[PDB]
Amino acid sequence: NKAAVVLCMDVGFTMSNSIPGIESPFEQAKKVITMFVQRQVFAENKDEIALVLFGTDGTDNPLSGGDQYQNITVHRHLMLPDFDLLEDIESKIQPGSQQADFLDALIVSMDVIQHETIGKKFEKRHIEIFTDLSSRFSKSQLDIIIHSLKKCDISLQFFLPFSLGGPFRLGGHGPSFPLKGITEQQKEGLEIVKMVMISLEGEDGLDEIYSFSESLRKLCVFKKIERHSIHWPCRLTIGSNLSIRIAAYKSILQERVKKTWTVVDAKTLKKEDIQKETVYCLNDDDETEVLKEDIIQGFRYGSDIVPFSKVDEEQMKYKSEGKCFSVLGFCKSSQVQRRFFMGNQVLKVFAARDDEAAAVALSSLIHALDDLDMVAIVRYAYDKRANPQVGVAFPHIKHNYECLVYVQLPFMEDLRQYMFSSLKNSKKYAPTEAQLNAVDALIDSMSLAKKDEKTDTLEDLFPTTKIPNPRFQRLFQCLLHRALHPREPLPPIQQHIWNMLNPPAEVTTKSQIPLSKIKTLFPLIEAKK
Amino acid sequence: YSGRDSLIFLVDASKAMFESQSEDELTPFDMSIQCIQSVYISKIISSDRDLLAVVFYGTEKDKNSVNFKNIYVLQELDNPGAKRILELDQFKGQQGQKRFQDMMGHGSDYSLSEVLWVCANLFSDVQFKMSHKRIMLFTNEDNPHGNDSAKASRARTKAGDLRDTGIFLDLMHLKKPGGFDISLFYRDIISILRVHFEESSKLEDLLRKVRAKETRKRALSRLKLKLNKDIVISVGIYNLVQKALKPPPIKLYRETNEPVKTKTRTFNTSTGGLLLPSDTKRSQIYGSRQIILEKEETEELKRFDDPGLMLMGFKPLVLLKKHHYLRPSLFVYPEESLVIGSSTLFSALLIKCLEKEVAALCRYTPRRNIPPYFVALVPQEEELDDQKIQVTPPGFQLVFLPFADDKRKMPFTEKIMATPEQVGKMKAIVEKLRFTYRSDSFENPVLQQHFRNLEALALDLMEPEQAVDLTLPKVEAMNKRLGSLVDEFKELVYPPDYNPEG
């Protein structure tokens, strides 16, 4: 629906400064808010956005009654964003000199929300604050603020110039700031906010406080303002005597740009003045024009082509009978390999909501299929006009719920066969022992998995699945550059985009020597490009 | 690209194939007729880009450019067509065979040297890149050249010469009541112990209609994976599974049936004059403001890295979510065209990663102005079946890693358990419904029906063949095998009044 989201940015001078070689926390915060607002505008979200600034040189808010909520200047009220907001963030936002308590800014922002959430409805009320915790704060309204947030259900997420939990890479892996340089003011603010949101949320409080650089490669900033995926209301069927209502969801789905490139004039810049047509003229007889409907489709048939209208096929088509999800059988999970998972999306299916009998049945099915290392074969049909397809249903159990996952499966027509040669039997390409050892050393120096201390758990040095696709970031960067500067060349790819693009440099340093071993031990020759 | 396949069909024009000991069964001539119809239909579906011919021997008359008596070419080497199918079907049946015997001779003597000469000439007429030269004979007697010793000698000499020239002769067993009598005159003469009173050697598959495009081996792209920046290795990328789609239609005229081409023009509105791509401006309106840009910036904003692969690191196969699937995977094989010696290193890395059970995650750039995704390269060890033929290629499986914005959020679902006896009921039901699945068990019935209709209308049949859909569950058999279990588990879970349907 609509999200009542407001941003409270500190215009303090303290984060206006930074260690040389590290961008200012004000500047990195500006980068994060610019990317957030560019996503907001370029996704054309119907969520109203407001901007409140505290620590400003002046003070501008309805709560300024004298010595109350000072250094707080409200920049934007709650409405839809615009390119004007982007240009104000880029230019009108400047590093100030004053500091103020962030609790006062929180109270002002929540009062603004209450004064502006009226007259409409909102699916969510949310706020994020960027701060370095180096500004003095009065821990007085913490209980009142917590109670008000609980009674009004406003979600919060916090981000820091330094890492929450040497090399420095903004928007990339590696340390963001050493943890031994935080002032005691920062430490006390950290403890206070820790206890505040631990009480507000529970144990997952520490999961919403993060750092700027890590948030540049993660959806945590948008993690509380998203939209749920619509369900597929249908019914699974077993035989002619069992059926359960279902609600399927496309858990994994490829993303596409929702704004096509409209064509306009080169002079008037109008699509109206530049419209389109197509012409079906005879290939012979001086290009005599065949009338638009006089054309009829045909089809290649071996060495011949037969005229064949669409009406004929639609009256002889193999019709699919509505939307149905019929199980076709069961096979062992070992009979299926990852190379046979077809389709461009993953259906993390579910039964009908609030159907406890369906929940019990699906849980029993999940247990039976899991204990037997067993999988099911099901047939899918989106609707009458859809194309029936075969797919695989395999269990997936989370710590809080069990589930079934559907992925479409191929037919014989989709299969192809390409013969190869047994490289393991290739006498002319047997690796030498020194080369094998160098390869092993390089693999050790290259692996992105470390066995965690005192545990059998395994960590990842590159969480790819939690990083978005970077087409949109550069797209919006160039779009805003053109909108603000429609006379200048496009801005190149920003460095943080490479930081998220590149793996940790420590792995590269480890691989430095084994890479030299590999290049010395392998006589690889090239060819002209 | 490699050579093509050439097929030759040579039926004896005699009395043996027009007669049978049991007329209820099919005459050898007529059954060969349905055989060639089926193989031509399969060829049309699969590899219509090859050459097929029809020729008869032993006929009273003759017609061939070689001008050998009793040798009559019926169809030259050509791509199959519905005209050929009908030209063959008019002789089909116990009346078409009588017609054939009416305006076409049969029963005269012949020379296998002569038929080898004419078939060699016909193969020599083909100037295209061939790879297979298969000749199928249709007779049930090894005697007719054993009668004349010199004839058998020259026939086997020419057969040896032909088989040495790359020509492959294969034997079609024909139903001889006295026995086909192999090993007497054939295995010493054919290119390769029951005397075969019957005919079915593999005629069952020959008559079996096959609906498959069976695209030949090709390379999608030979990308060149860079290790860090300079140690770069050529690799080949294939798709052993690839969605088969219906061929596009053909715009043609509804009064002459010839394909009419279409030309498309961008032009003015106020004037209507034809305009140029320079006159075209990319526009996108956001909110109320329109941003103007051109195409070149549009693809340059998609151009970050050169076409290739950039290693991200190594990760054990356990660290990937099973439900984490984005797009069908690819197969990666070593390539020694651009980088020579990469096969040795490919073997080394495959061995090492198989030992270490770690897949290789890389940044993938398919082509220019293309987005570099994240790809996991799982080792894929070669597997051989009982006959030691490769059922699993050796190499790597390249799967795709969806991004954070490539995953959608769902409403929260709670956990509701079930009694273990309901789990036992499910296990019993599954066991009553269990079987073994294979990838070659289920097809696309929609496409099969579309085909059957296409050939039916091409053959002008009064009715099309109905496609057999294996995706329709046999509800009666499933209910028969379940019986009590269904409503037992229903009463176990669903209240008697609360049916699954409200």
Partner: peptide
Amino acid sequence: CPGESLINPGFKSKKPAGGVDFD
């Protein structure tokens, strides 16, 4: 050659679709 389609050289012999059995 065993396990090869006589219809199409260079391709495995095709068997009719087996459907499903019961154990």
